[PDB]
């Protein structure tokens with residue numbers, strides 16, 4: 001009863017998402033886009049209930065796309081499937097340029113590493 | 123030669139950061155703030171080169187604060203020390219309301235879990 005949009009650049013990963021969805025098998029039609037541009041066109045043209053969203057795409061960043069989705073009150077739910085970790089989001093999606101991201105709890109050694117990274121940066 | 127601002131609501135954590143900076147011993151003046159408001163005041167008034175920043179504070183979110191710093195072109199380096207994971211950033215800092223956040227690589231089981239999370243939210 002619900003339609004899915006898969007936004008992911010890697011065709012092998014697209015194949016798996018598609019494959020895993022069909023194993024579960026509870027969905028109507030599954031659309032694919034490798035880019036944000038084509039994702040926006042499909043959301044405008046088709047009725048989509050859920051989006052599986054990668055972050056690093058060829059034509060841009062999935063967090064900006066998701067932020068635009070919410071700004072414009074788009075009627076979709078989203079699941080992020082990505083390789084991105086916290087620092088990747090902070091630096092590569094947000095562009096906030098932090099020296100490091102330390103997950104609590106941290107060791108002294110890990111703490112020192114973050115300081116070395118500051119020093120090497122100057 | 124480098125001054126530090128610690129922005130962290132938990133006094134024990136502040137104490138540890140302070141301990142570790144002293145052990146490394148290459149810093150001048152180490153300021154502390156438990157809140158964003160006090161951090162902004164210290165940044166406006168004192169010489170500070172590096173900030174150790176927490177995300178969940180009592181009076182707001184470190185990501186928003188970080189975003190303000192960059193907006194205002196504050197000449198300061200930042201290291202994030204926090205308990206926040208990716209989903210915490212996407213949903214609690216950004217407010218993007220994603221159903222789930224799947225880190226690649228994932229298992230079929232984990233994938234199913236994220237779909238269940240979509241279903242159980244109707």
Ligand code: BEF
Pocket residue numbers: 054055056057081082083084226
């Ligand atoms: F390229 Be995705 F963010 F894994």
Ligand code: BEF
Pocket residue numbers: 104176177178179203204205206
């Ligand atoms: F409160 Be913090 F984000 F660890």
Ligand SMILES: [Mg+2]
Pocket residue numbers: 008009010054055056057
């Ligand atoms: Mg990608």
Ligand SMILES: [Mg+2]
Pocket residue numbers: 130131132176177178179
């Ligand atoms: Mg906190």
